[PDB]
Amino acid sequence: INFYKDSYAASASKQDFSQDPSKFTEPVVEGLKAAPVL
Amino acid sequence: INFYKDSYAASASKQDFSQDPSKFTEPVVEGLKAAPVL
Amino acid sequence: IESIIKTATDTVKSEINAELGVVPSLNAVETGATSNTEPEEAIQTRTVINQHGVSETLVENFLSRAALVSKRSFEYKDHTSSTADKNFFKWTINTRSFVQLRRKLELFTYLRFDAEITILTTVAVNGYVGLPDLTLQAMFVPTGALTPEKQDSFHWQSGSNASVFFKISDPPARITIPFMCINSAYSVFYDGFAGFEKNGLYGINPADTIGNLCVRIVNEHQPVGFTVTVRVYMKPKHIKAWAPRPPRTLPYMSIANANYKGKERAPNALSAIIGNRDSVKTMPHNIVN
Amino acid sequence: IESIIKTATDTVKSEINAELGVVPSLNAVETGATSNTEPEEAIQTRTVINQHGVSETLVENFLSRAALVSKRSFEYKDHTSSTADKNFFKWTINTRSFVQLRRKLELFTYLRFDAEITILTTVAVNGYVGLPDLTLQAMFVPTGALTPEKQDSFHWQSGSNASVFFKISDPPARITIPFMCINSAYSVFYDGFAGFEKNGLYGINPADTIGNLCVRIVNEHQPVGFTVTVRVYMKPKHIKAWAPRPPRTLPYMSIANANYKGKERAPNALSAIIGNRDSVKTMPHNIVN
Amino acid sequence: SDRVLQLKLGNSAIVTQEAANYCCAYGEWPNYLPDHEAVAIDKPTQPETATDRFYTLKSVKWETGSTGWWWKLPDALNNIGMFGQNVQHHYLYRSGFLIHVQCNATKFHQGALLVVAIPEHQRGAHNTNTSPGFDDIMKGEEGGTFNHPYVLDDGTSLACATIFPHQWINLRTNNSATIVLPWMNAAPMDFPLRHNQWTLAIIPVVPLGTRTTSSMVPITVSIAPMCCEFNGLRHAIT
Amino acid sequence: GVPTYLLPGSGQFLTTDDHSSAPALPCFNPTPEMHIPGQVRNMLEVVQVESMMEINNTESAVGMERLKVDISALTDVDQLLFNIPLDIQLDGPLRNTLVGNISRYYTHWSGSLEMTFMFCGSFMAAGKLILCYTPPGGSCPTTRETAMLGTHIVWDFGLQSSVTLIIPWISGSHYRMFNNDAKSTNANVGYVTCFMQTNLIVPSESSDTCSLIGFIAAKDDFSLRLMRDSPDIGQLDHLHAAEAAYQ
Amino acid sequence: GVPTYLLPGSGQFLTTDDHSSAPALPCFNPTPEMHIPGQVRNMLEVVQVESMMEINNTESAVGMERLKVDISALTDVDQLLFNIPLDIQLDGPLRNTLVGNISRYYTHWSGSLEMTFMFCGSFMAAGKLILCYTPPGGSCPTTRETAMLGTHIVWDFGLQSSVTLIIPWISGSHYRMFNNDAKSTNANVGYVTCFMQTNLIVPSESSDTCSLIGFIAAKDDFSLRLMRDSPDIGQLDHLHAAEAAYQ
Amino acid sequence: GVPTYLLPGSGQFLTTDDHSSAPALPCFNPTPEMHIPGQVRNMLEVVQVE
Amino acid sequence: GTHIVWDFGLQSSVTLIIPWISGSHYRMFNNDAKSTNANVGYVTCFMQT
Ligand SMILES: COCCn1cc(-c2ccnc3c(NCc4ccc(OC(C)C)cc4)cccc23)cn1
Ligand SMILES: COCCn1cc(-c2ccnc3c(NCc4ccc(OC(C)C)cc4)cccc23)cn1
């Protein structure tokens, strides 16, 4: 329920389930094998 | 009337009329006759 | 076999029997089955079309009634000299302190439910000036979070704890708490020990720990003292229930255990649950004319 | 690669390995990548279908909880002889004064959010007569607008400032403030100086300046003094967050900087964050039976 | 017909010629944990016939003053055979049980035993505020005796105990009772040394009596774990 | 805005109300459901399970002795053995039963009852009993040729250990009340009486005295109405350690 | 108008509520969004990043010295090198870690952990270690032939510097608790122990003593539940210059 | 939320008002209806009797 | 070990199978009864009740 004119008034947005942890866990230029890694 | 985002907020669910009393009244492996029962 | 039952069963008319080899009134209790004798088999019956509903004994309806779970009174005053709940209290959340709710819940072995919480506040002047319209804060402190130590400690800033602020002049404060067990159901009874050593608590499943309820008055103290009483009501809802149990017969002794003593004499004595009659042939309320 | 994750991952059953040239438990930490060893590669596993949701660690849910940002008490009285907040106060808006909210926000480098503000008011009689149902005015004074100098100054006429008027007997006053940075995100940390000369403030991005909150009692003073406490709560919402950070370990010293001292001894001492054990071979809570 | 029964599990078999059907608790049968209910991600060991076999406990004497007897599961089996060894080396266990209770007498004897499997039989103490201690609860293979069978030692009642899975041995009618127990827990698996899912209770609601020459009338309990699984292999607690 | 007005009952706390209310923990995910044996969905499933009657509620019956009735060989014909008070509201053999305990959370009831008796003598013991239900209106019958005029079953002891007497729902009203006035026409059910039809006959090496266990359950025509606080439980004080939850 | 009534909970301030509220600045246009590196959307992405364990949490380890474990050549076989307490709630090597710090805002947890060890001796240093996880129930093993019975990896030092021990989620319940009672069956995870499998062997011109750095992260089967105030931070007083915001 | 304002007559108890109100006994099943002789539906039926 | 629990009843008789449990295809009828090529193990009877 949102009868206010400005959209920033709305209730919280708990629906964004997109993740990309590899930008923190694997920021290497060459992706690693699941051969030895070096 | 439920305008809350979480479904556990809803009012009570008084609509489940399924019963199976035989799981307490007749938990025998062989169902009994309506011959003598032993 | 599962079926949908909205009303009590109809009765069919029945005739005289006299069939050899058929004995529907004989049973074998040793099997553990309950008697399957129908009324039509025991007597000659008429036809009755039965319209009585069964909705009031639904487990949802039986349990989803708001009941008192906690009641605390404390002095709202300047506490500088007191030794006491100093404008706030902490409560370790449990369902075992008030026997009417406890006995109904203990009809089952496992329960899954969300908890509707209603918080009712009342105030009286200490031994009159009128009653103040105070603001209260209730804060839920989960396991391993720190409880407040003072009325004004920084724990009350509630950065991640859920708090509700409510006035005395408001309608009672209300919130729902989800089913929060780490298992799929609460263990209403627990034949086990809470810890990996031998000295842990018997009878309390660690999986069922809710946490602490912390309630303060937010106003600074007035020049005069008041007594404030907080009552907490729980209503289970969205209920599933498993494995029905023998009801409690002896008075409860403790919130911590099932210990029992009985009443000093029947009814509900340890030696005699039902009150005595003079003999097995005595009819106690026999009609005589 | 971005993907939509609603639940924790399933485990597949695994067999015995013994493959030459394949060493999934060996890794190279020097690359800066985290270990990619899967459980199925380290041990023989069963199949588990995993139904645990991940919604409670969403950044929106983690941060969008209302937390105390400001708390001010002032005397509501005739102030003609006082030297003091004379029925009003001014607050320079910041997120750094209460550590529980501060530490959660400081897990990130950049944040974009709208701020839901709840204003809770409480009153006590000075050392009793009953509590007055006062009207308050909160006025937002942006950068370069003039702040009020008195309880009754003409700045309170609020021709273009946003004001909210609220009673003590009301529910807490609530408003939303939009994301108002002159950049696309707030700088939670700022490795820079605010001015073009060398003497400007280190560590505060000028781009993030919100302004001042001015709160007065609107009633004229009564014949008796009261203490009024105003509590302001902020809830971030519609949150985007960038570049996660090492959490704060040492106690905060100042709202103005990251300065640190540590506790006098572990835990959270400057020389020892974790409390000591007797040796690297000592198990502190070892089960013994 | 259904007075004779044979039970075969592993290398063990039991025959009775005087059964009274048998009970499947709540109409369930034991099963292994399916993938859509599993929690622990390691591959379970499933020893099958090494564990899923009848173990016979020490017999108890039925005497005119007896209050009745109880055993807790898995506690009573945690030190027996390969079931005990798997229990001692694994953090987590799960199983059903097959319970077979044996008591025979002459056609001149009378007496009735209630044989009831109680889930989560959390015991109370009598006439004290102090909760039962570890040695009051964890009796192992020997089991315990009821203090106040009339209230099931839990302040409830014997009279309503028929709400639980049960049979009777009525000496006139039958000489054995059989109850099949599914896994009965709020979690899918449990630590076997700190929680008991089931208590077997045997209570003499009608006392043993006769006017023949007296003999020792024993009650014997045989229990087969069913569909045993173990997770979290480590050194034996033992 | 919407023009509105408040009704009577605004702001009340009714303990049986049914509304949605604010979730205190947003985005909380409850533990996945798991199948558990023995789900109950209606309390009527519980009262259909038979449970022992405390028929021997006499002084000099202690504990378990109260759940059985002892029968002996008699030397006079047609003798009365026992009677069962049928008032579920007043304290008696039916109160501490599954049907009894659940029904006492309700005020109104309807439908038939079954009593089952198990004979627990020796195999060599023989006998016939008559079990009679008398509809209400008069005194409980004390002689067999009076009790015989009501609803009854004649029970022969044999290989089948147990007999059922149905107590049929015979009532002018749709419901009866659990009324403390047991003589009220809205409450009184009548009586169950047991007589010798023949005799208990046993050889010398059997025990001369044999026991019955009585059981009661509701049939599936049974209904309960108007929920109330059960008078079975109460507290006069705080329980032990209830104060310690505040410390 | 519409007839209405107020429910319990009317007018309350619940800090986790979720409603729209009045915009104080009408027609305000927020700054256009700009792409920024490193957006996080779930806190589970952070706990999957490995971070150093404070394994050497001993007196006479100061600061950075607490983040490494020193290994020396031994003259006895099979010797214990170190153990790691696995209780995340109680203070120990795991607390000040990314997985540790984020998890302490929650009460319930599930799923597997990975420990990675990096050997930082010289190139000429050789050795084999055994890393063991013991599921809970007994004492922490003090001998290699006991620890060897649990989950383990045997690590050979080589060109790949680092080894992972997976700690698999082995639990009876769906979740564990971050419980201050570390011996609770709902909380205790068991133990990690490190033994010599062979020995540390080095030539004369290498340093005779070599270090391990231990790291921990969660795997992607990991879940957190029931948000709470983290016990890691607190204040006893106003911060410096917090009063000056009112002046 | 919805912006609202209270009218005159808000909170009054008018004895002839006609609103729904909160059921105190949820899921109560009233006794089945039975035909009874002599139902009256309008009081004008009574005043037509001499 | 391998066992049967025998209840006396209308059927007079019970069978215990001794299953062929051996490492080798055959055993020997060896006068050295303790030889691993010969020893079969034991049958024992106990009271169950
Ligand atoms: C058969 O029963 C065994 C299982 N079992 C369930 C519960 C239970 C669960 C959740 N809650 C409870 C409560 N709720 C108090 C409350 C909590 C948080 C609040 O939050 C506000 C401060 C924002 C308010 C009030 C009071 C009493 C009991 C409970 C206890 N045992
Ligand atoms: C990680 O954080 C770094 C970025 N950051 C965001 C904020 C912030 C933004 C907007 N507002 C805030 C507020 N709001 C007080 C308020 C303002 C106007 C009001 O208007 C009424 C008088 C009509 C009412 C209350 C209190 C505290 C903080 C804020 C501060 N720093």
Automatic annotation (TrEMBL), chain E:
Q: Which domain of life is it from?
A: Viruses
Cell location: Host cytoplasm; Virion
Species of origin: Human enterovirus D68
Q: How does it assemble?
A: Interacts with capsid protein VP1 and capsid protein VP3 to form heterotrimeric protomers.
Q: From the Swiss-Prot or TrEMBL record, give the protein name.
A: Genome polyprotein
Report the protein's function.
Component of immature procapsids, which is cleaved into capsid proteins VP4 and VP2 after maturation. Allows the capsid to remain inactive before the maturation step.
Q: Tell me which family the UniProt entry assigns to this protein.
A: Belongs to the picornaviruses polyprotein family.
Picornavirus capsid domain sequence ranges = 16-208
UniProtKB/TrEMBL annotation, chains F, G:
Query: Organism's domain of life?
Result: Viruses
Subunit description: Interacts with capsid protein VP1 and capsid protein VP3 in the mature capsid.
Q: Please describe what this protein does.
A: Protein 3CD: Involved in the viral replication complex and viral polypeptide maturation. It exhibits protease activity with a specificity and catalytic efficiency that is different from protease 3C. Protein 3CD lacks polymerase activity. Protein 3CD binds to the 5'UTR of the viral genome.
Query: Where does this protein come from, organism-wise?
Result: Human enterovirus D68 (EV68)
Q: Localized where?
A: Host cytoplasmic vesicle membrane; Host nucleus; Virion
Q: Which family does it belong to?
A: Belongs to the picornaviruses polyprotein family.
**Full-protein interval shown:** 318 to 564 of 2188
Q: Which residues form the signal peptide?
A: none
What lineage is on file? Viruses, Riboviria, Orthornavirae, Pisuviricota, Pisoniviricetes
Which protein are we looking at? Genome polyprotein
From TrEMBL, chain I:
Q: Which family does it belong to?
A: Belongs to the picornaviruses polyprotein family.
Q: How does it assemble?
A: Interacts with capsid protein VP1 and capsid protein VP3 in the mature capsid. Interacts with protein 3CD.
Q: Where in the cell is it found?
A: Host cytoplasmic vesicle membrane; Host nucleus; Virion
Function in brief: Protein 3CD: Involved in the viral replication complex and viral polypeptide maturation. It exhibits protease activity with a specificity and catalytic efficiency that is different from protease 3C. Protein 3CD lacks polymerase activity. Protein 3CD binds to the 5'UTR of the viral genome. RNA-directed RNA polymerase: Replicates the viral genomic RNA on the surface of intracellular membranes. May form linear arrays of subunits that propagate along a strong head-to-tail interaction called interface-I. Covalently attaches UMP to a tyrosine of VPg, which is used to prime RNA synthesis. The positive stranded RNA genome is first replicated at virus induced membranous vesicles, creating a dsRNA genomic replication form. This dsRNA is then used as template to synthesize positive stranded RNA genomes. ss(+)RNA genomes are either translated, replicated or encapsidated.
Q: What is this protein called?
A: Genome polyprotein
Q: Which domain of life is it from?
A: Viruses
What range of the full-length protein does this chain span? 467 to 515 of 2188
